[PDB]
């Protein structure tokens, strides 16, 4: 796992939760990590079809549209 | 912003990118943060319709299904 748990716990508290189980924080961190990886994988293929090696913000923005 | 950028950069490198612009890392961190907040907001309403104050892993798992 790359994402730290603490910041994910703050997101859920920030959205209005009174109490958050430790298992809720870990579940959302793993779901967002898996989303990040699938978006990143699609952004890499977009950059390669554009002839580039550098992943740019427009690749991320176009890749997220396949998941919406 | 709650999520740190560095770990998001590692996710994109881990998925296979050779080089990542700083703007790509920031864009994906903001998209995952916004997803985390919308999931968390829906999980809070599920827990309240179940009569609970504590957000649990099953609330997260049911809330992500509205976005798939
Ligand atoms: Cl998926
Ligand atoms: Cl949205
Ligand atoms: Zn996946
Ligand atoms: Zn939203």
The maximal CA–CA distance of chain B, rounded, in angstroms, is: 49
C-alpha distance from B11 to closest chain A C-alpha (Å):
6
Query: What structural domains does chain B harbor?
Result: 1-68 (1.10.20.10)
């998001």: which residue's tokens?
B8
- CB-nearest to A55 from B2, B12, B47 is B12
Going by C-alpha positions, the residue among B7, B47, B60, B52 that lies closest to residue B29 is: B7
Q: Give residue for tokens 């999980």.
A: B43
Q: Which helix (H) or strand (E) holds A27?
A: helix A22-49
Tell me the three state secondary structure of residue B55: strand
CB A39 within 8 A of CB B8: no
Nearest-CB residue to A16 (from B8, B10, B44): B44
- Residue A19's DSSP bridge partners are B54
As a whole number of angstroms, the distance between CA B12 and CA B9 comes to 5
Resolution in A: 1.5
> Which residue has 């509205």 as its token pair?
B66
End-to-end Cα spacing for chain B: 24
Long-range CB contacts (within 8 A, 24+) of A39-44: A39/A63, A39/A64, A39/A67, A39/B28, A39/B31, A40/B11, A40/B12, A40/B14, A40/B15, A40/B17, A40/B28, A41/B15, A41/B16, A42/A66, A43/B12, A43/B17, A43/B24, A43/B28, A44/B12, A44/B15, A44/B16, A44/B17
Length of chain A: 68
Q: Work out the burial of residue A35: count CB atoms within 10 Å of its CB; fewer than 13 is exposed, 13-18 middle, 19 or more buried.
A: buried
């Amino acid at each position: 796992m790359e994402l730290p748990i603490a910041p994910i716990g703050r997101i859920i508290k920030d959205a209005g939760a009174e109490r958050v189980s430790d298992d809720a924080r870990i579940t959302l961190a793993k779901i967002l990590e898996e989303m990040g990886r699938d978006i990143a994988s699609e952004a890499i293929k977009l950059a390669r079809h554009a002839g580039r090696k550098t992943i740019k913000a427009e690749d991320i923005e176009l890749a997220v549209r396949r998941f919406k």
